[PDB]
Amino acid sequence: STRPLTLSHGSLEHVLLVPTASFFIASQLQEQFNKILPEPTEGFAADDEPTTPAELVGKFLGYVSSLVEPSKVGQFDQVLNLCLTEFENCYLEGNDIHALAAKLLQENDTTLVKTKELIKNYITARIMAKRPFDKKSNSALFRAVGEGNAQLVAIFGGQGNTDDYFEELRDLYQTYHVLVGDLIKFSAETLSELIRTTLDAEKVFTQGLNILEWLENPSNTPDKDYLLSIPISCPLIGVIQLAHYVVTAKLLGFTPGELRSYLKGATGHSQGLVTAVAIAETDSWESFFVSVRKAITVLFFIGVRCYEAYPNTSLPP
Amino acid sequence: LCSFITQDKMFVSNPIRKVFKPSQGMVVEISNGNTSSKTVVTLSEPVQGELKPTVILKLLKENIIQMEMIENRTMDGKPVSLPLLYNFNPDNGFAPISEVMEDRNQRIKEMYWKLWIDEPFNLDFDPRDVIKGKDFEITAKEVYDFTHAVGNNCEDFVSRPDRTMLAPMDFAIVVGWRAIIKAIFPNTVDGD
Amino acid sequence: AVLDSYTPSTNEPYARVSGDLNPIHVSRHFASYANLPGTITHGMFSSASVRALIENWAADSVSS
Amino acid sequence: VLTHRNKDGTGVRVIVAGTLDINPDDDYGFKQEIFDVTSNGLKKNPNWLEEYHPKLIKNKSGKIFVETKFSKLIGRPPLLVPGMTPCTVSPDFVAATTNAGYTIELAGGGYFSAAGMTAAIDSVVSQIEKGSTFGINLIYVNPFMLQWGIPLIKELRSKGYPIQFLTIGAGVPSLEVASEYIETLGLKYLGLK
Numbered sequence: 001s002t003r004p005l006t007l008s009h010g011s012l013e014h015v016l017l018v019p020t021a022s023f024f025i026a027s028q029l030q031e032q033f034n035k036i037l038p039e040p041t042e043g044f045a046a047d048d049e050p051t052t053p054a055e056l057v058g059k060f061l062g063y064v065s066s067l068v069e070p071s072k073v074g075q076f077d078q079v080l081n082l083c084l085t086e087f088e089n090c091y092l093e094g095n096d097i098h099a100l101a102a103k104l105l106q107e108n109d110t111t112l113v114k115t116k117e118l119i120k121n122y123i124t125a126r127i128m129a130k131r132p133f134d135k136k137s138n139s140a141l142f143r144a145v146g147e148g149n150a151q152l153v154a155i156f157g158g159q160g161n162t163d164d165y166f167e168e169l170r171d172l173y174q175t176y177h178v179l180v181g182d183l184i185k186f187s188a189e190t191l192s193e194l195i196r197t198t199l200d201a202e203k204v205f206t207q208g209l210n211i212l213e214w215l216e217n218p219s220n221t222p223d224k225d226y227l228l229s230i231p232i233s234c235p236l237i238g239v240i241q242l243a244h245y246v247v248t249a250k251l252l253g254f255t256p257g258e259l260r261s262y263l264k265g266a267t268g269h270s271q272g273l274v275t276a277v278a279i280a281e282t283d284s285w286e287s288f289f290v291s292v293r294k295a296i297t298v299l300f301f302i303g304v305r306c307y308e309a310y311p312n313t314s315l316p317p
Numbered sequence: 318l319c320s321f322i323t324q325d326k327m328f329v330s331n332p333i334r335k336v337f338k339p340s341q342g343m344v345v346e347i348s349n350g351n352t353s354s355k356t357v358v359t360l361s362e363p364v365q366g367e368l369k370p371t372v373i374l375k376l377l378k379e380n381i382i383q384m385e386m387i388e389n390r391t392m393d394g395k396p397v398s399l400p401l402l403y404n405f406n407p408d409n410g411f412a413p414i415s416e417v418m419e420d421r422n423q424r425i426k427e428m429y430w431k432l433w434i435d436e437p438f439n440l441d442f443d444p445r446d447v448i449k450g451k452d453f454e455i456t457a458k459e460v461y462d463f464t465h466a467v468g469n470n471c472e473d474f475v476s477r478p479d480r481t482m483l484a485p486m487d488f489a490i491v492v493g494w495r496a497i498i499k500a501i502f503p504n505t506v507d508g509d
Numbered sequence: 510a511v512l513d514s515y516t517p518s519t520n521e522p523y524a525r526v527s528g529d530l531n532p533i534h535v536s537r538h539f540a541s542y543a544n545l546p547g548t549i550t551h552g553m554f555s556s557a558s559v560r561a562l563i564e565n566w567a568a569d570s571v572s573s
Numbered sequence: 574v575l576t577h578r579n580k581d582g583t584g585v586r587v588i589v590a591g592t593l594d595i596n597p598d599d600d601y602g603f604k605q606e607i608f609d610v611t612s613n614g615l616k617k618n619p620n621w622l623e624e625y626h627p628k629l630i631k632n633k634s635g636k637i638f639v640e641t642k643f644s645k646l647i648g649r650p651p652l653l654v655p656g657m658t659p660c661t662v663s664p665d666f667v668a669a670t671t672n673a674g675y676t677i678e679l680a681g682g683g684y685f686s687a688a689g690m691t692a693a694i695d696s697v698v699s700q701i702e703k704g705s706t707f708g709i710n711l712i713y714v715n716p717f718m719l720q721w722g723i724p725l726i727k728e729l730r731s732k733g734y735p736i737q738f739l740t741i742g743a744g745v746p747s748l749e750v751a752s753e754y755i756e757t758l759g760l761k762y763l764g765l766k
Contacts, residue, residue, distance in 0.1 A: 410648030
């Protein structure tokens with residue numbers, strides 16, 4: 001039933017065995033994809049260019065994914081699910097995309113930016129191919145903690161670890177959109193409410209708190225100076241932490257609480273204490289969201305009220 | 318449609334035409350359009366978020382067009398209005414509409430008075446007489462509002478523990494505005 | 510020093526604190542009737558806005 | 574096309590059936606019209622007579638007007654005392670004639686500086702009724718008058734003067750010179766001779 005098809009860039013091939021009622025639509029995609037590929041150059045060493053066969057498959061893998069919906073049935077659902085299995089079976093030795101990215105960094109042609117690409121592609125692809133991340137994974141850590149030769153403690157960070165904190169929220173939203181989109185949107189909305197709900201909160205958010213907007217159009221994102229002042233930076237940092245918890249939980253095949261169970265305990269530094277408390281109150285996904293609400297609605301008030309208490313004033317130049 | 322208005326033999330560009338010039342957000346509602354003498358076109362624009370009447374165009378007794386020019390942001394929330402009056406006259410096909418000039422400055426002054434001055438409308442001052450203002454206590458919050466309005470983040474104006482709040486020299490204008498502006502109002506200083 | 514300044518998005522904020530409810534600055538139909546380029550920023554705002562710059566950079570933020 | 578130029582003004586519209594080309598004038602039509610579906614395929618020619626057929630019309634005060642393209646714009650009888658030097662120089666006569674409800678052109682020929690004509694234009698205005706208007710006749714072959722005049726006219730309109738048309742005698746300005754008058758001066762219409 002199998003009928004060869006090559007995914008091509010520069011001196012990099014990946015031969016792709018294709019089913020019968022398929023090689024039609026498959027070739028169509030192959031062609032369209034070939035068009036978008038930037039011209040090869042000096043070991044494909046540009047920024048758009050795939051470094052390796054693996055990266056290329058991820059590329060095409062992501063291109064096909066761009067043309068599908070989970071809600072309605074598509075005509076590429078056939079091809080996508082097939083390139084998935086061949087990428088998985090061929091390039092992932094069963095481990096996580098993350099393990100591959102590391103290999104591709106260490107051994108092959110190092111690009112953090114390209115690594116992130118590859119990861120965006122695989123997770124994104126898989127989730128839009130109606131093919132979720134529910135089956136406990138063989139995390140050697142979590143396996144060994146589970147047995148008894150290891151124990152976990154969740155530590156949560158505070159304010160002031162980074163100049164560009166909001167950046168971490170971007171990379172999260174942008175990369176793992178298929179996993180975190182919910183609570184980003186959920187938070188963006190629930191924070192919006194806190195501001196109506198609250199008396200003079202509006203005055204503190206001089207340039208508004210449209211988190212969803214700033215994410216979509218970087219162009220519209222306010223200064224680091226605005227983003228860093230607590231009333232908006234406290235809640236946002238927490239969302240970042242919650243968001244990270246979730247990619248770890250979801251990607252392990254665990255519920256929020258299932259993840260929490262592997263923990264000997266948790267603790268935060270400064271404002272990170274809040275999420276640790278709220279994280280341990282966590283059980284099932286349906287219930288996960290009130291836990292989020294609690295956390296960020298605390299942070300919001302810490303931020304808004306502590307700013308009001310002692311607000312930054314001009315430094316004598 | 319008449320491109321020009323009249324003011325004492327002088328020809329101005331048509332103000333009605335001007336004020337109704339299109340633009341996203343404005344909405345015109347003509348009511349009773351088919352009978353001439355009763356027609357009332359009404360312009361409503363977005364004012365502080367919600368829509369509201371800004372202009373009201375109709376006829377009055379004895380062939381007098383009236384353009385009710387409405388300001389919604391006032392001292393007490395109760396909208397104020399400037400009555401602009403125009404003589405319509407079908408015997409001059411070329412310049413039918415001319416403006417009623419007698420007392421035009423006075424009407425404009427009266428509306429500005431209601432917006433600036435918390436006193437009775439009396440335009441009978443001697444320009445040479447001293448104008449007394451009002452006493453004025455500087456609230457801690459009038460300062461917060463002003464500094465934040467102009468964007469002055471000086472620590473001398475921000476409430477800090479164990480320091481009295483200072484007011485910006487700029488704040489002088491907030492205090493004297495009513496005493497000062499009154500000075501351009503008397504009848505002997507007739508201005509538009 | 511050479512400093513970068515900006516006029517406000519709307520004029521209502523300055524009008525409220527100052528008591529200058531002049532429609533020229535707030536209502537487009539009045540601005541347009543007077544034949545202005547738009548809803549002109551309060552000349553007084555620029556006065557206090559620029560002054561703030563002088564205050565900060567020339568007086569080292571010593572209001573006094 | 575031969576028959577077309579025979580008929581021109583009579584509402585007949587010739588179409589050349591055998592050539593798909595383009596007429597810069599729309600004088601007549603080519604192969605396309607015979608087949609077009611749009612209202613673009615139904616193009617008729619003007620019939621002077623009817624097109625520009627004098628009419629009568631009534632004021633509300635019930636005055637009667639000879640309605641033509643001209644009077645339809647100006648709102649008075651389609652008759653005018655053209656600028657004339659000795660005759661139309663006098664602010665008195667341009668007032669009187671304009672007060673009698675007729676369009677008259679104030680003669681530039683008799684004025685020699687912005688200041689001297691400003692004198693008359695202001696006299697004319699003093700005698701003319703409220704909301705009334707007149708015009709100014711300037712000579713092309715006199716580049717001096719044309720130099721203090723065009724400005725005086727523009728400076729005057731800007732102040733809102735009731736002088737709402739310019740006529741130019743002795744020659745027709747060039748496209749850039751004319752365009753200047755049209756857009757620069759605040760005039761209701763321009764008169765060419």
